[PDB]
Structures are given as structure tokens and as C-alpha cells.
Amino acid sequence: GEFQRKLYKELVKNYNPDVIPTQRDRPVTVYFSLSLLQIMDVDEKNQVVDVVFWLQMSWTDHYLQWNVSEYPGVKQVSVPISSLWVPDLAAYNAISKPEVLTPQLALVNSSGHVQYLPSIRQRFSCDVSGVDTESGATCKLKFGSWTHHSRELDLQMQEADISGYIPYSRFELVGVTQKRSERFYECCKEPYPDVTFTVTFRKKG
Amino acid sequence: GEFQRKLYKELVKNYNPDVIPTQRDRPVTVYFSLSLLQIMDVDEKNQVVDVVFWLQMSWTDHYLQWNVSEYPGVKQVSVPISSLWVPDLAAYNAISKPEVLTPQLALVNSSGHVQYLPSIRQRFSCDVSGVDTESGATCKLKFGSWTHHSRELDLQMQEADISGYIPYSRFELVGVTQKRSERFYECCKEPYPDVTFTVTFRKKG
Amino acid sequence: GEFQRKLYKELVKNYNPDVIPTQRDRPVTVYFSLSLLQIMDVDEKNQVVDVVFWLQMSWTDHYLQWNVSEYPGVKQVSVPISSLWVPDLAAYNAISKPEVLTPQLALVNSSGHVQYLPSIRQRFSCDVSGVDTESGATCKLKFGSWTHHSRELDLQMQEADISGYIPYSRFELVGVTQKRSERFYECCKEPYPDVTFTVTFRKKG
Amino acid sequence: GEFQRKLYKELVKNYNPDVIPTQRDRPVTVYFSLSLLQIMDVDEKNQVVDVVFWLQMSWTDHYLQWNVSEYPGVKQVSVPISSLWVPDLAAYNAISKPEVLTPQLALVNSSGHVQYLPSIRQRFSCDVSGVDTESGATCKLKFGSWTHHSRELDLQMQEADISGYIPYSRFELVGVTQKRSERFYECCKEPYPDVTFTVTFRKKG
Amino acid sequence: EFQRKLYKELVKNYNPDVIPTQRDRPVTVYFSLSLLQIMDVDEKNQVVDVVFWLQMSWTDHYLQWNVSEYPGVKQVSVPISSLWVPDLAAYNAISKPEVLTPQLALVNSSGHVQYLPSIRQRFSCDVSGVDTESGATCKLKFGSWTHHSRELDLQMQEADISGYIPYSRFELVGVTQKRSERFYECCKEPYPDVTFTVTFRKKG
Ligand SMILES: CN1[C@@H](CC(=O)c2ccccc2)CCC[C@H]1C[C@H](O)c1ccccc1
Ligand SMILES: CN1[C@@H](CC(=O)c2ccccc2)CCC[C@H]1C[C@H](O)c1ccccc1
Numbered sequence A, B, C, D: 001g002e003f004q005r006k007l008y009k010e011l012v013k014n015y016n017p018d019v020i021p022t023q024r025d026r027p028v029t030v031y032f033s034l035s036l037l038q039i040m041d042v043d044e045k046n047q048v049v050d051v052v053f054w055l056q057m058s059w060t061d062h063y064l065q066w067n068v069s070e071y072p073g074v075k076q077v078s079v080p081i082s083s084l085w086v087p088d089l090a091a092y093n094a095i096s097k098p099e100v101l102t103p104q105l106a107l108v109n110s111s112g113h114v115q116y117l118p119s120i121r122q123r124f125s126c127d128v129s130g131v132d133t134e135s136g137a138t139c140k141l142k143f144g145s146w147t148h149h150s151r152e153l154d155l156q157m158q159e160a161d162i163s164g165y166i167p168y169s170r171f172e173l174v175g176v177t178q179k180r181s182e183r184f185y186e187c188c189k190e191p192y193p194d195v196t197f198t199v200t201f202r203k204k205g
Numbered sequence E: 001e002f003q004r005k006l007y008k009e010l011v012k013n014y015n016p017d018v019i020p021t022q023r024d025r026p027v028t029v030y031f032s033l034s035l036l037q038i039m040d041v042d043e044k045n046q047v048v049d050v051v052f053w054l055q056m057s058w059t060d061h062y063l064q065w066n067v068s069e070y071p072g073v074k075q076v077s078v079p080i081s082s083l084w085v086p087d088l089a090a091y092n093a094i095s096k097p098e099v100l101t102p103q104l105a106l107v108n109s110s111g112h113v114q115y116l117p118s119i120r121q122r123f124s125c126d127v128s129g130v131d132t133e134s135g136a137t138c139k140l141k142f143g144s145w146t147h148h149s150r151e152l153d154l155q156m157q158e159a160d161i162s163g164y165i166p167y168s169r170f171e172l173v174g175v176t177q178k179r180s181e182r183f184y185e186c187c188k189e190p191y192p193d194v195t196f197t198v199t200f201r202k203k204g
């Protein structure tokens, strides 16, 4: 639409993706969930698991709201993430950079609510030695902001799903849990929340 | 051409490649098809198939049409895709990033019709356990827009091609079917169409 | 010299590297040749050949001429290819991205004649099954413009060279031939020329 | 933050990340320490060690201090390192480029103190031949500025931390020391300091 | 605060694509390779994997500065992307160079530039002799890709093998370096190169 150009133009001049959109005495709440799609491989020598997963990330950016009457037909837009502030969520125990599989686009509606749903493949340090047993091997995937504490970035978890897990895999799921925690570090007196996805899996047969 | 040089000039000042060129509540229709070239490898252990294929993609961008009377002998132009809006089609079940092998340019005519034909190598999740049997392995290669629903981006299919299939590969191409679906998801009120290419193949000998 | 700087400044102000420098119905002729340097490897299981080769491309860009008067001591200059229009030659049957080994600069002279001479490593689809036989394996390295038909870009060949081929390779060269063909594709009305280099090689011992 | 937008804007407008924040007769002091997280692998044939570690770098950049009265609510911010001057620290005996695993953001406070804490995977040259003996292999990970001598960049160490060392790898930690040295080089009139992290480890029984 | 204004002048009044020659006089660049480690050899495919240090230096007359105008500035550390740098190609490389160090060069007030990258690269080489007393010999050949000798005068400095790792499986037999120059049938001007040569063999 013609308004669409107008909207994106405003994004270039009148917005900074480096600025965390906190609002006085209020952190930015980001919602986070992980859906495991496939355990690609394990390395029992190097203690690594290779996984493909779908992240669901959402938050409100008050700077990203616009007036519907000003851009009539425009309700939500598809935006390159590079143009937007994005939570600096890090995989604490990853041992490779993430490979993002999908278009690096996010949805933004007129209230400034952003959803970023990337599919990702990444390797993680894990004790995978129990993988050929009945109890399986348990890998914890730990995520959290690298630089923002809880009063600036309130990480919350959404309910996760094993429904997307590939059925014809050589690994079967014995269990999964997802939990939010909040721990202090020696440096700063503010805590840093984390969301941990724990998967227990074993070889079929 | 010199009267071809001004045409490109209009691209920069006016046009935004982030903006899907929907007209007045009419979706952008993209015609989509795949030519299979070579099945490079399968991974029986990790359930992966590695393919090389061309995507034929075409659509009309009404922001990209020009008065042919105003520009003498310019019937069409070759434009870098980074200067153009392109459909954010993703391979839903890919486990690797697409490796684009060809120059990243699209053909645009004065109707604003755009043609983009990349050659791609990509690895997909697939049950390849039957590959050595007479019935062989059947892989679904499923594509759709990552962020746009059918009212915005209407994905339609054209005839798939296999004439370009390599005849000296170790895999015999049994068959290939293509189908379009228009499905609602639990998340949104709008359907998101997909085109799926089903490839049945098996080891020769 | 202190005129190169003015010469380069003119490039930015007026020149568009996406515009193909055609004239009054005249296509840009580009002279093309490939020199085979080394056959790196073969994959007999996946039907792939890995080659390092030197491409020679030359053409005249009528927008890149300058009067030697207004730039006294400037015979020729070395320009980043990103500042120039360059032919979008693709290896039709590659199955990997080209790895350009050398600096990405072309030479341009006062009459707008441009020379671009990259050294490249790339993997191609090829029936290498006869490699250990007397007959050997034959591979076709096929190159052409990805988006410009024969009336826009006239691809012509020049003499081929094997003097540059490594003598200590495990692969013995037998024959190298080149030819120019003009052929039709489903997408398009007009013919697209190609130059194909045919390599026949075999193991020693 | 209304005041954060101002601060980030001022960074772009009135700061050059290419300039080392040395003062009038005074070097920049950078504090540096390496925390070993996991020895991923060793190659006894090529003499390499593959390690994952967490670096702590901090220094004061006097051009990054700000008056709190001009930015009332703002005590510290997370800034992309690309926007900052950062110490050009290189691993002397590295044989691969660093794979930075974490978000490339540093914390800056109002007195210009910067903290950058990347997680890194990187391969180093090392005599790993004693890895299966009781004594173990000893690897030196040596770091220093690549272009700045001690009078412009003063490199100092901090207390080490092996409390993050993965307990379930096939390698056990024997000895781990860290020392600062100030070597001279035949070229330059000026000495160049280095920090060296020495790991002794062996294969578990 | 003075380096600040140096970098500012560099932005408006300098094009890094322009070779800093003068009135009919080439830019001389000095070049030397120091071998650090032979990482591996491929005996089937005829390839050697090496890690080395390149010393490159030259004078860019556009990069000199009045020492009066900037009091306490001896040398500055500058991103190579902001400077003209020689387009030196490895003629017989079979992979892209992997640069291991920060991409910065030193420039002083005379406009002398020093660029010292450390690099991992793979080259075509006959390594069939690597297990013999005489050993394998590999040539590492470097030269400008687009500038003839009357524009870019490549000259060589003495190499260095003191930086060579003592604990690899390869002992060094012999090392040498030489400057060369030839006319190519194609072009009117001659072109120079510097070739570094190693001879090495497995230990034990
Ligand atoms: C980054 N770090 C904290 C950093 C911090 O506050 C700090 C630490 C040390 C000194 C000064 C500040 C903030 C919250 C995330 C946490 C991550 C964890 O450290 C870590 C380090 C290395 C590997 C895995 C995980
Ligand atoms: C790509 N195609 C033509 C298509 C075009 O004009 C084009 C190219 C790129 C972008 C937009 C349009 C141009 C010349 C190369 C040729 C290759 C052949 O079609 C082909 C593709 C797939 C299977 C068999 C044959």
C-alpha cells in the first residue's frame, strides 16, 4: 500500500534499533519459547549435540506503535530484524554460531508488538554419554540476555511444544522441561533471568 | 542504453524493497515452481537429503512498471534482487541455509512483471530409510512465505520440471508430484498458502 | 596520479554498475575464455568434479571511456568490480558457489575496454565414473549470462590455454575443447548463448 | 529512553571508533582475562587444540564518559562494539579466526568504562603430543595488541577462572597459569606487552 | 584530541581505490613471508596448508601529514579498508586467504604504511617427496594482480624462519625467496612477483 512506504520511511529516520525500549520503572518483557524440530546428531567424543529448533520471541516496543488513522489499511508489517531493536538473547552453552534457516523478518503490529519466529540450527556442549541407554542423555539448552538484567529485560517463557518434532528421527524424546530461573552473578547486584530447555533423549532400538 | 540509465535512477529515490507491492487490497500473486537437478546425497543416519534445484518465481510489482513510450528501446532490465521486493519464501523443512549458486539478479519488464530463477543447493529433513528399496524414499520439499498470508501474497504453482534432471546420478528419479495447499493456522485469522514438491527416488542397482 | 582521483570521482557521480552498456541495438560483446589450472578432486559417489580455473573476460563499456586530454597521464586504471558493470556469467552446472581466489578488480582503459581475470575454485556436476579408465572422464564446464540474451550480451570465445595446467596432478589431461552455442529455454523467447569447455581426463599409473 | 536516544545519537555524531582513546601522555589500560570453558578437540597429527573460552576485557575510554545531569536516568547502556573503539587484541599462535559465539555488545557506563565479555571458539597451534601421558599436554594461548605498543595500550591481566570448565569432557585440567610479559621486537623501538594463558591438560582414564 | 581530525581528513580527501603513484614513478612495496607452520599436506590432491606472516610496506604520499599541525602524533593504526593497499594475489593458492589478525596498518607522518597480516592459506604443491630425505618443495608465489612494475614496483625483504614452530611433524630442509619479473604475451608492460620456496620433510 501507499501508506506502507510512508510507514517504513519513518522507520529509517525516526527510530534507533540500538535502544532498548524500556519505559521508566518498567523493563521490556520478552516472551520466549523453543520448539525442538530435530536432533541432527551427537558427538560422544567431543560432547556436543546438534539441534534444529524453532524459537518464538515476542515483545512490545512502544517506539514501534503507529496511528491506524494515519496509515489506514496497515495493521501489521513484515520488517527486517536489522531495522528493529531485538533482545540480545544468547545461548549460554552453545559452541557454534547459530545458523538461521528462515527469512530474518519479524512481524510488527500498530501497538508496536513484535514477533520474531526463526528456525535455527546450532550445536551445544552436552554430556551425551547416556544416549544409548533407556534413561537417555539429558541436554540443557540455556538462554538469556547477554547484557540486560531483569529490571531492563524481563525474560518470560511461553509454553513449548514437541508437536513439531520429526517422527522418523533416530532419536526419541524421553522427556522435556522448560523453566525460567533468575540468578545473581558476582559483579552486579541485579539478577539475570534465564530460560532453560531440558531435553532427555535416546537412540531408537 | 542512455534512456535505460534514467530508468534505474527512479529505483533508488522512490522504491523500498522492504515493502510488499500489494495494490488496493489485492494480493501479490507469485507463481512458483521447482526443477530438480541432482540429489547430491542422502544421510541415512541423520535423515537428510541434499538437493540442487532451480526455483522459478514470478510476480507483478506495480511499482516497477514504466511508460515504454517514455523510455525508447528498453523492453526489460536486469536488477539486483537486493534492490527489489522479493517473496520471503522459505523451505519449511530445510535443515541448512540455501546456497544460491547463480547471480542474484531478476528480470523486470515494463509491465512490472518480475522473473527470478535461482539455482539452489539445500539440505532437507527427510525419511530416507527406504532409499535402497524398490519403493524407495519419498521426500517432501515444502515452501511458503514466512511472514505473509494469502490476502497479501497469493502463492500459486506452475508445472514442475524434471527434464533437467541429471541422468548419471546414483539415484533414480521414480516420480515427482507438486501440490498447493491454502491452510489456516491456530495463530492467525488468515490462511498461509504452501507449495509442496514430493520427490520419490531410489538407489540405482 | 592527481587525475585518477578526478577520474574515480566521475565514476561515482554518473555511472551505474547495474546498467548493461549496450548501444543502438548493439549488444555488448564479451570475449570469454577458461584456463584449467588444476583438477582438485573427484567424487565418484556423488558425481562431482572440483576445479581451479582462470577466467578471462573482456568487453568494451562505452560509458567508461575518457579523453586522454582531460586526464593527461592516465592510460588505464584498476577498479573494484563493484563499481563496474560486469557480465553476469553463471556456471550452469555448478553445484557449489564460486570461490574467487584473486582480488576483485578489473582493468579499464581510456577507450572503455575492460578486462576482468579472476582465478576461481568451484565444484561441478559431472559423470566422473570413467576416470580410472583409458577413455577417462569427460566434464563439461558450461558458462553463460544468467539474465541477458544474445541481443543484449554477445558472448564470444577466444583461444584456450592448457599451458597453465599443473603437471604434478594425479590427473592426466587428455583433451580440452571449447565451443559457443546458442540455445532456447522455457522462460524466454530469445536465445541465450553459452560457452562450454569440455575436459577429458584420467588417472595416471 | 528519551535520554538513551540522545546518548546513542551523540555516539554516532561525536565519536570515532577508529581512534584509540589515549590521553595526553597516558595510555589506555586494558584489563584482560581468559576463562576456559571446554577443550573441544586436539589434533595430534597437525598439532592443534580447539578451545571454547570466555574473554573478559575492560578499559576506560575517556571519550565515552557522559554527564549524568544531561542523561538523568541513564547509568549504563549496551552498545554494539562496531560503534566503539575496541582493543585490537590478537591471538598470536592462533591458526583459525575467532568464532564469536555471543552477542557483540559491550556495557558502557557514564565514566566511560567499557566491558566486553565475548564467548569464543578458536583453534591454536600447540604441542599436544603429551596429551595421553600423565604429565599432559601444555598449551600456551598468547594474546597481545597487534599494532599498539605499551605506551599507547597498556595490557594488564585479571584473576583467572576455571570454575566454568565443563566437568564432562574427555580432558581433565592439570595446571592453568596466566602471566604478563613485556617483550621487545627488532623492528620497533617500543616494547609490546602480552598476556599468556598456559593450560596443561590430559586425557581422562 | 588530534588523531580525531587526522581520520576526518582521511574521509573527505582520500580515495583508497587510487594507487599512490607520482609523476611517472611507481609505488615501491616491500614484501616478505615468514613461515610459521605447515599445518598439513594432501598427498592425493597435491596441496599444502600453511600459516604465515606477511610483511608489507610502502609509501603513500597522500598519507603524509605536517607534523606541526598534529603535535604528539607519531603513527596511527588505521583500518586497511580506509587505505590503498597493494592488490597482491597468491598465484597458486587454491583457497581464499584466511586472515588471522586485526586488519589494521600503521601509517606515520611520512606516509609510510606497514601492514603485517598473519594468514592461513592452502596452495597447489607437489608434495609427493615429503616422506623422502630430499623432501617436498613448494613454491609460494605472490604478485600484484592488476598493476605492472612501472606502477607497482614489488621488491623483496629477507624472509624469516625463526618464527617456525619447532614441534610439527615437518622439519625444514631449505628456504629461499626471489624477486622475478616477466612480460606476458597479453600486456605491454612487464609484471613482477616474489616467490617464497620451502623444502620440508616428515620427521622420525
Ligand atoms: C554475561 N554473564 C554476565 C556477565 C556479567 O554480569 C559480568 C561478569 C563478570 C564481570 C563483569 C560482569 C551477565 C549475564 C549473562 C552471564 C553469562 C555468563 O557470565 C557466562 C559466561 C561464560 C560462559 C557462559 C555464561
Ligand atoms: C536461467 N535461464 C534463463 C532464465 C532467465 O531469463 C532469467 C534468469 C534469471 C532471473 C530471471 C530470469 C536465462 C539463461 C539461463 C537459463 C537457464 C535455463 O532457463 C534453465 C533453467 C532451469 C532448467 C533448465 C534450463
Ligand SMILES: CN1[C@@H](CC(=O)c2ccccc2)CCC[C@H]1C[C@H](O)c1ccccc1
Pocket (backbone or CB within 6 Å): A054, A115, A117, A119, A164, B092, B093, B144, B145, B146, B147, B148, B185, B187, B192
Ligand atoms: C511461520 N509459520 C506461520 C505461522 C506464524 O507465523 C505463527 C505461528 C505461531 C505463532 C505466531 C505466528 C506463518 C507462515 C509460515 C509458517 C511456518 C510454520 O509455522 C513452521 C514453524 C516451524 C518450522 C517449520 C514451519
Ligand SMILES: CN1[C@@H](CC(=O)c2ccccc2)CCC[C@H]1C[C@H](O)c1ccccc1
Pocket (backbone or CB within 6 Å): D092, D093, D144, D145, D146, D147, D148, D185, D187, D188, D192, E036, E053, E114, E116, E118, E163
Ligand atoms: C606484530 N608484532 C609486533 C611488531 C610489529 O607490529 C611490526 C613488526 C615489523 C615491522 C612493522 C611492525 C607488534 C605486536 C605483535 C607482534 C607479533 C609478532 O611479530 C608475530 C608475528 C607473526 C606471528 C605471530 C607473532
Ligand SMILES: CN1[C@@H](CC(=O)c2ccccc2)CCC[C@H]1C[C@H](O)c1ccccc1
Pocket (backbone or CB within 6 Å): C037, C054, C056, C115, C117, C119, E091, E092, E143, E144, E145, E146, E184, E186, E187, E191
Ligand atoms: C593476471 N596475470 C596478468 C593478467 C593480465 O594482465 C592480462 C591477461 C590477459 C589479458 C589482459 C591482461 C597480470 C599479472 C599477473 C598474471 C597472473 C597469471 O596470468 C596467472 C593466471 C592464472 C593463475 C595464476 C597466474
Ligand SMILES: CN1C[C@](C)(O)C(=O)C=C1c1ccc(Br)cc1
Pocket (backbone or CB within 6 Å): A007, A008, A010, A011, A014, A015, A063, A064, A065, A066, A067, A077, A079, A108
Ligand atoms: C517509529 N515510527 C515513528 C512515527 C513518527 O510514529 C510514525 O509515524 C511511524 C513509526 C513506525 C514505523 C514503522 C514501524 Br514497523 C513502526 C512504527
Ligand SMILES: CN1C[C@](C)(O)C(=O)C=C1c1ccc(Br)cc1
Pocket (backbone or CB within 6 Å): A092, A093, A094, A095, A125, A142, D037, D038, D052, D164, D166
Ligand atoms: C551452562 N552454562 C551456564 C552457566 C552455568 O550459567 C555458566 O555460567 C556457564 C555455562 C556454560 C558451560 C559450558 C559451556 Br561450553 C558454555 C557455557
Ligand SMILES: CN1C[C@](C)(O)C(=O)C=C1c1ccc(Br)cc1
Pocket (backbone or CB within 6 Å): B007, B008, B009, B010, B011, B014, B015, B063, B064, B065, B066, B067, B077, B079, B108
Ligand atoms: C518507480 N518508477 C517511477 C516512475 C516515475 O513512474 C518512472 O517513470 C519509472 C519507475 C521505475 C524505475 C525502475 C524500474 Br526497474 C521500474 C520503474
Ligand SMILES: CN1C[C@](C)(O)C(=O)C=C1c1ccc(Br)cc1
Pocket (backbone or CB within 6 Å): A037, A038, A052, A164, A166, B092, B093, B094, B095, B125, B142
Ligand atoms: C514439513 N514441515 C512443514 C509443516 C508441516 O508446515 C510444519 O508445520 C513443520 C515442518 C518441518 C518439518 C521438519 C523440520 Br526439521 C522443520 C519443519
Ligand SMILES: CN1C[C@](C)(O)C(=O)C=C1c1ccc(Br)cc1
Pocket (backbone or CB within 6 Å): C007, C008, C010, C011, C014, C015, C063, C064, C065, C066, C077, C079, C108
Ligand atoms: C563517468 N565518466 C564520464 C565522464 C563524464 O566522461 C568523465 O568525466 C569520466 C568518466 C569516467 C570515470 C571513471 C572511469 Br574508470 C572512466 C570514465
Ligand SMILES: CN1C[C@](C)(O)C(=O)C=C1c1ccc(Br)cc1
Pocket (backbone or CB within 6 Å): B037, B038, B052, B164, B165, B166, C092, C093, C094, C095, C125, C142
Ligand atoms: C548442464 N546444465 C546446462 C543446461 C543444460 O543448460 C541447463 O539449463 C542446466 C544444467 C544443469 C544440470 C544439472 C545441474 Br545439478 C545443474 C545444471
Ligand SMILES: CN1C[C@](C)(O)C(=O)C=C1c1ccc(Br)cc1
Pocket (backbone or CB within 6 Å): D007, D008, D010, D011, D014, D015, D063, D064, D065, D066, D067, D070, D077, D079, D108
Ligand atoms: C561521545 N559522547 C559525546 C558527548 C557530547 O559528550 C555526550 O553527550 C555523550 C557521548 C557518549 C555517547 C554515548 C556513549 Br555509550 C558514551 C558517551
Ligand SMILES: CN1C[C@](C)(O)C(=O)C=C1c1ccc(Br)cc1
Pocket (backbone or CB within 6 Å): D092, D093, D094, D095, D125, D142, E036, E037, E051, E163, E165
Ligand atoms: C606465540 N608466538 C609469539 C612469539 C613467541 O612472539 C613469536 O615470535 C611467534 C609466535 C607464533 C607461534 C605460532 C604461530 Br602458528 C604463530 C606465531
Ligand SMILES: CN1C[C@](C)(O)C(=O)C=C1c1ccc(Br)cc1
Pocket (backbone or CB within 6 Å): E006, E007, E009, E010, E013, E014, E062, E063, E064, E065, E066, E076, E078, E107
Ligand atoms: C588526506 N590527508 C591530507 C591532508 C588533507 O593534507 C591532511 O591534512 C592530512 C591527511 C591525512 C589523513 C589521515 C592520514 Br592516516 C594521513 C594523512
Ligand SMILES: CN1C[C@](C)(O)C(=O)C=C1c1ccc(Br)cc1
Pocket (backbone or CB within 6 Å): C037, C038, C052, C164, C166, E091, E092, E093, E094, E124, E141
Ligand atoms: C604459480 N602460477 C603462476 C604462473 C607460473 O605464472 C602461471 O602461469 C600459473 C600458476 C598457477 C599454477 C597452479 C595453479 Br592451481 C594456479 C596458478
